[PDB]
């Protein structure tokens, strides 16, 4: 039937940054959670709240698909209730989450021998992010007591740093494309079901 659009959300030309992750509603379609295992020999499929073989038996109404690129040593931070410089200022999952965080190495897709300011991450922020919140704002972070007046100087930093992605790095510094498949079920006719 109408296969869910899991082809352009996973196999895309360029993915998102950690501070500007993209949501995508996936609905009015029949999801097939089996074509994902063509993507990468190195393919983690950590799920929460749902068994990896139970998605093909339940019906949901709106399955959301986030996307961002994080370094290796930072996947673990995409988990319910876990701290870190990425899971506090860029993307935080709720403590009671129902989904499947998916990650895979992408050192061949997007890693050029130069460093490109293509993937950014938020290093400084006022407070921690609420669950499912995106802050694309780029105001000058006041790190001291004097006002910044919109100029990045002393005690006033730019709140976005750029990752360095080179193929010569170790497994703990190569880019990892991550997609968080959320599943919500409201009082509405469920459209996203399994292949029957």
């Amino acid at each position, epitope marked *: 039937t109408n296969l869910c659009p899991f*082809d*352009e*959300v996973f*196999n*895309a*030309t*360029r*993915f*998102a*940054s950690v501070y*500007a*992750w*993209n*949501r*995508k509603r996936i609905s009015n379609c029949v999801a097939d959670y089996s074509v994902l295992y063509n993507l990468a020999p190195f393919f983690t499929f950590k799920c929460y709240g749902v068994s990896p073989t139970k998605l093909n038996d339940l019906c949901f109404t709106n399955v959301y698909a986030d*996307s961002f690129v994080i370094r290796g040593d930072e996947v673990r931070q995409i988990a319910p209730g876990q701290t870190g410089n990425i899971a506090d200022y860029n993307y935080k999952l709720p403590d009671d989450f129902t989904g499947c965080v998916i990650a895979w190495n992408s050192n061949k897709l997007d890693s*050029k021998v130069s460093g*490109n*300011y*293509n*993937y*950014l991450y938020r290093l400084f922020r006022k407070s921690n992010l609420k669950p499912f919140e995106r802050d*694309i704002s*780029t105001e*000058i972070y006041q790190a001291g007591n004097k006002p910044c007046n*919109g*100029v*990045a100087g002393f005690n006033c930093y*730019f709140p*976005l740093r*750029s990752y360095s992605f080179r193929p010569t790095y170790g497994v703990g510094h190569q880019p990892y494309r991550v997609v968080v498949l959320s599943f919500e079920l409201l009082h509405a006719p469920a459209t996203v079901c399994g292949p029957k």
Partner: antibody
Amino acid sequence: EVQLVESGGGLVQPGRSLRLSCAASGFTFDDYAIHWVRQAPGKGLEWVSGITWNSGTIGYADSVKGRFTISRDNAKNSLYLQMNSLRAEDTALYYCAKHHQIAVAGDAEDYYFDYWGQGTLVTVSS
Amino acid sequence: YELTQPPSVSVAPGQTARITCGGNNIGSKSVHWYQQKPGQAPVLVVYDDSDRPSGIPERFSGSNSGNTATLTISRVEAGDEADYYCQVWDSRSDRVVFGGGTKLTALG
């Protein structure tokens, strides 16, 4: 039909920052990559940056790396471009150009603009 | 990449004009052209060297071969005086390379 209205622009001192916006209206702001392209007064065109349908940069120029940052908001139908550390050679009419194709998954990267706007004169002087 | 165009190409409104854009090995990557009247926004003309958008007359045509892309405008008129730019992708540096456009001026 397509109305790529661009807001944000004016006189700013060398070394300060401003934020540009581009409110789209007419098409679906979830399947078309939208770029930013400048044009100095009577001095040709120049490409700044761009973002695909998923919010991801398609690259920067050879003179705006590290100083410019582009962001996309698919819910409000608006593309944003942050300009930090402006200099005297950044005075131009910044356009907001779209992409003709629908950005299918498996293809070859080739961006050609089909709908343009009017631009905002971002003058940088003392 | 780096595209180079003739700074000015003039032709009487009886014949065709020859606008070229040459680089290093621009024979395979797609070459798109743009037209910009003085004051207005750049409009689209024949792209991919083989097809034009909806509305552009059949007079506009293109051809790319090896190291030269030719935007041959047929039956040039007075209302076609504009600044024509050529575009390329250059997947090597993740950019969008334009070029110093040509000022087509109907002489006479």
